[PDB]
Paper text:
The hexameric configuration lacks the tight interdigitation of β-sheets characteristic of canonical cross-β fibrils, such as PSMα4-IIKVIK and eukaryotic steric-zipper amyloid segments, resulting in a smaller solvent-accessible surface area buried and lower shape complementarity at the interface between the β-sheets. Moreover, the cylindrical architecture of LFKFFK polymorph I is reminiscent of that displayed by a polymorph of amyloid-β fibrils, and a HET-s prion fragment. This farther support the role of self-assembly in antibacterial activity and specifically the hexamric arrangement that forms channels along the fibril axis.
Amyloid aggregation plays roles in PSM activities in S. aureus.
Residue numbers in the entry:
A (entry chain A), B (entry chain A), C (entry chain A), D (entry chain A), E (entry chain A), F (entry chain A), ...: 1 to 6
């Protein structure tokens, strides 16, 4: 799993 | 699964 | 499945 | 597990 | 385990 | 175990 | 065990 | 055991 | 045992 | 109820 | 009820 | 209830 | 209750 | 209760 | 109760 | 009770 | 009770 | 009771 | 009075 | 009075 | 009065 | 009066 | 009166 | 009156 | 009156 | 009156 | 009156 | 003079 | 003079 | 003169 | 003159 | 003149 | 003249 | 003139 | 003139 | 003139 | 030369 | 030359 | 030359 | 030359 | 030459 | 030459 | 030459 | 030459 | 030459 | 190949 | 290859 | 390779 | 290799 | 190799 | 090798 | 080798 | 070898 | 060898 948030 | 949101 | 929305 | 936050 | 905080 | 604090 | 404090 | 204090 | 105090 | 707006 | 507007 | 706003 | 704001 | 602020 | 501030 | 301040 | 100050 | 001061 | 424009 | 603009 | 701007 | 700014 | 700034 | 600054 | 400074 | 300085 | 200095 | 464009 | 742009 | 930009 | 920037 | 910077 | 810096 | 430094 | 240093 | 040193 | 696009 | 993009 | 970006 | 970045 | 960084 | 660092 | 360090 | 150290 | 030490 | 979409 | 997205 | 993201 | 992050 | 972090 | 930390 | 610590 | 401590 | 202590 990969999550990216900005 | 891939999701992209902006 | 592919969905694109703008 | 890797988490990065700034 | 490694944790870094600043 | 290693801990560093400043 | 090693501890350093200043 | 070694202790140093100043 | 060694102790030093000043 | 569901509402979506953009 | 369903409404769609664009 | 769920609300999302950006 | 959960609230998230950025 | 949990609150986080930065 | 736990509080952390920096 | 525990308090830490620096 | 324990207090430490420097 | 124990007190230490320097 | 109601006005709607898009 | 209510006004909404996006 | 309420105003919201983003 | 309440004002919030970020 | 309450003011908060960061 | 209370003021806090860091 | 109470003042604290570090 | 109480004053403390270090 | 009490004064302490070191 | 008034001009409006969208 | 007034100008508005988004 | 007033200017606002975001 | 007033200027505000963030 | 007043200037504030952070 | 007043200047404050931290 | 007053100057304070720490 | 007053000067204080520690 | 007064001078104090330790 | 002038070009405008939206 | 002038270019503007948003 | 002038360039502005946000 | 002038450059500004934040 | 002048450089400022924070 | 002048340099300032904190 | 002048140097200051703390 | 002048040097000061504490 | 002058030297002072304590 | 060139593609443009808005 | 060049890609641009906003 | 060059990548730019904001 | 050069990487810049803020 | 050069690394800079703040 | 050079390392600097504060 | 040179090391400096305060 | 040189060592200095205070 | 030289040693100095106070
Ligand atoms: Cl990515
Ligand atoms: Cl993509
Ligand atoms: Cl597509
Ligand atoms: Cl990373
Ligand atoms: Cl690291
Ligand atoms: Cl380390
Ligand atoms: Cl060490
Ligand atoms: Cl030692
Ligand atoms: Cl010894
Ligand atoms: Cl939907
Ligand atoms: Cl969602
Ligand atoms: Cl979330
Ligand atoms: Cl969290
Ligand atoms: Cl924690
Ligand atoms: Cl702790
Ligand atoms: Cl302790
Ligand atoms: Cl002890
Ligand atoms: Cl309608
Ligand atoms: Cl509405
Ligand atoms: Cl709202
Ligand atoms: Cl709010
Ligand atoms: Cl608050
Ligand atoms: Cl508080
Ligand atoms: Cl306190
Ligand atoms: Cl006290
Ligand atoms: Cl006492
Ligand atoms: Cl109109
Ligand atoms: Cl308007
Ligand atoms: Cl406005
Ligand atoms: Cl304002
Ligand atoms: Cl202010
Ligand atoms: Cl102030
Ligand atoms: Cl003061
Ligand atoms: Cl004083
Ligand atoms: Cl005195
Ligand atoms: Cl035009
Ligand atoms: Cl323009
Ligand atoms: Cl401009
Ligand atoms: Cl500027
Ligand atoms: Cl400046
Ligand atoms: Cl300066
Ligand atoms: Cl100085
Ligand atoms: Cl001096
Ligand atoms: Cl002297
Ligand atoms: Cl084109
Ligand atoms: Cl382009
Ligand atoms: Cl670029
Ligand atoms: Cl760069
Ligand atoms: Cl650099
Ligand atoms: Cl350096
Ligand atoms: Cl040095
Ligand atoms: Cl030396
Ligand atoms: Cl000597």
């Amino acid at each position: 799993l990969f999550k990216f948030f900005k």
